[PDB]
Amino acid sequence: EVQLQQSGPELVKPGASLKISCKTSGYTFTDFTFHWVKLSHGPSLEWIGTIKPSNGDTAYNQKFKGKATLSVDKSASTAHIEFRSLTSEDSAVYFCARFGGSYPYAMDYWGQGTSVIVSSGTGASDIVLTQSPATLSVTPGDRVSLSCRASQGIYNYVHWFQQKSHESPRLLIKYASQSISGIPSRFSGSGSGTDFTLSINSVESEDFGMYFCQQTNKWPLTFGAGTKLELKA
């Protein structure tokens, strides 16, 4: 049983520095790259960067280069992110995730997330992923198709995530169409190049929430704005 356990909620003053952690259990820590993801309103997901624990190599989203530093403590099997010059704009939920599982790897295990509050007191060529519809109101039993359009050809480097309220994202499909262990058969994916589809054969009541697509072909890794699947009035 693999687990990524994140440190508790934080509340800091503007201008402060903060180091938050992600401790692993149940597998060899140096196996897979670690990723940090920022959750903002919508919900919206942004990729901050990645660290390869075996050799310390990093790749950052240029938007976060002057803000965050990724590191690993191999002796403690713990990944860290340190923020500097914190402002109100940095208040968010931060998730750690590993990029592993059976080959080819994907963001399969995630931490529970860390809420960071910065208290007020008393990329020209980045791949754009267009998700439509932004909101989909359905009745259980309905057949649905969710679209993800890439700004340029990305082969089969698309992954689908489900995110329910107060929960961490859950990997549904990897590399456009590859099935994930434990994911119900009603979920399937198709497409290559620029047009990707997540199909829900017959929607269940437990399926309501956010559905995000993600590309991992080009740096920085990017997400779609998501499709909000909700119950019809």
Binding site: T50, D57, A59, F99, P104, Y105, T216, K218
Partner: peptide, 11 residues
Amino acid sequence: GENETDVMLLN
């Protein structure tokens, strides 16, 4: 360079 993330993420 059509697979620029492969060295980092898959190798």
